[PDB]
Design a protein around this ligand. Structure first.
Ligand SMILES: *[C@@H]1O[C@H](CO)[C@@H](O[C@@H]2O[C@H](CO)[C@@H](O[C@@H]3O[C@H](CO)[C@@H](O)[C@H](O)[C@@H]3O)[C@H](O)[C@H]2NC(C)=O)[C@H](O)[C@H]1NC(C)=O
Ligand SMILES: *[C@@H]1O[C@H](CO)[C@@H](O[C@@H]2O[C@H](CO)[C@@H](O[C@@H]3O[C@H](CO)[C@@H](O)[C@H](O)[C@@H]3O)[C@H](O)[C@H]2NC(C)=O)[C@H](O)[C@H]1NC(C)=O
Lengths: 34, 49
C-alpha cells in the first residue's frame, strides 16, 4: 500500500538534543497554543 | 567558509552529512576537514584593552 501528500510553506520549531538529533517539533499554524 | 582564528583539536561527534557547527548567535564554532574525517574547534585570537 502507498500514500501521497503535498507540502506547503509553513513555520516549524525544532528541538535538537546533545547528540544533535531532531526529537520534537511544533507547528505554528495548528492552534493558538502552538 | 572563511575567517580567522586558532584551530584546535576537539571532542565533538557528528553525523556523516554534517559539515559545520554553530553556537546560539549564529557563530561558527567548529569545522570538519574535507581530506580527513576530523573536527576542529575554532577559538578567537587574543585581544584586549
Ligand atoms: C549520545 O551518544 C552517546 C554515545 O553513544 C550515548 O551514550 C552511551 O549510551 C549507551 C547506551 O545506549 C551507554 O551504554 C553503552 O552501550 C553500548 C552499546 O550497547 C555498549 O557497547 C557499551 O559498552 C555501553 O554499555 C554508553 O555507556 C554511553 N556512553 C558513555 C560514554 O557513557 C548517549 O546516550 C547518547 N545520547 C542520547 C541518546 O540522548
Ligand atoms: C583521499 O582521501 C583518502 C581518505 O579520505 C586518503 O586516504 C588515506 O591516505 C593515507 C595516506 O596519506 C593513508 O594512510 C596510510 O595508508 C596505509 C594503507 O595501507 C595504512 O596502512 C595507514 O593508514 C597509512 O598511514 C590512509 O589509510 C588513507 N585512508 C583513510 C585515511 O581512510 C587519500 O590519501 C586521499 N588522497 C588520494 C589521492 O586518494
Amino acid at each position: 500500500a502507498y500514500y501521497v501528500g503535498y507540502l506547503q510553506p509553513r513555520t516549524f520549531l525544532l528541538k535538537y538534543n546533545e547528540n544533535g538529533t531532531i526529537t520534537d517539533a511544533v507547528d505554528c499554524a495548528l492552534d493558538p497554543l502552538s | 567558509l572563511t575567517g580567522t582564528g586558532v584551530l584546535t583539536e576537539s571532542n565533538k561527534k557528528f553525523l556523516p552529512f554534517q559539515q559545520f557547527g554553530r553556537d546560539i548567535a549564529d557563530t561558527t564554532d567548529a569545522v570538519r576537514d574535507p581530506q580527513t574525517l576530523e573536527i576542529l574547534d575554532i577559538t578567537p585570537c587574543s585581544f584586549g584593552g
